[PDB]
Design a protein around this ligand. Structure first.
Ligand code: NA
Ligand code: NA
Ligand code: NA
Length: 157
């Protein structure tokens, strides 16, 4: 069964645990390119009463650097906010809990904005069918495939 974080039947406890960054996408491609601040490799999501603790690592010159962020629930169900390289809010438009998680985030910094979409998997990779479903979801948000980057062969330290 699939759900959206903004849907009535969403069960946030079910996204707890191990996750891996499979694909990242953005309408500002530089943000997820090699030295981008949003080229983030997820490791786990810890679900709390009104927050999610996100554990990630970034990579630079082949060196991994850990980072944790706390995302707080906002006034809208299914929406979380977090301060990181500006102000971010995000939702999970689609997850099946057991294989994949698709997130949609809006970043605002210095009076600007951009959209970030991420495809996360329970294992370090996902099937081609799930990756195509993600490309379709990015298209629905106006993000071209040329701005979608598969990081499945670069998500391990
Ligand atoms: Na730039
Ligand atoms: Na694989
Ligand atoms: Na579509």
């Amino acid at each position: 069964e699939e759900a959206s974080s903004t849907g009535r039947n969403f069960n946030v406890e079910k996204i707890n645990g191990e996750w891996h960054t499979i694909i990242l996408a953005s309408d500002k491609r530089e943000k997820i390119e090699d030295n981008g601040n949003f080229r983030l490799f997820l490791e786990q999501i810890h679900v709390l009463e009104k927050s999610l603790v996100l554990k990630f690592h970034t990579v630079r010159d082949e060196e991994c650097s850990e980072l944790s962020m706390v995302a707080d629930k906002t006034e809208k169900a299914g929406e979380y906010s977090v301060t990181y390289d500006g102000f971010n809010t995000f939702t999970i438009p689609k997850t099946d809990y057991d294989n994949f998680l698709m997130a949609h985030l809006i970043n605002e910094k210095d009076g600007e904005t951009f959209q970030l979409m991420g495809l996360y998997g329970r294992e370090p990779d996902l099937s081609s069918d799930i990756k195509e479903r993600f490309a379709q979801l990015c298209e629905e948000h106006g993000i071209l495939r040329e701005n979608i980057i598969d990081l499945s062969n670069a998500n391990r330290c």
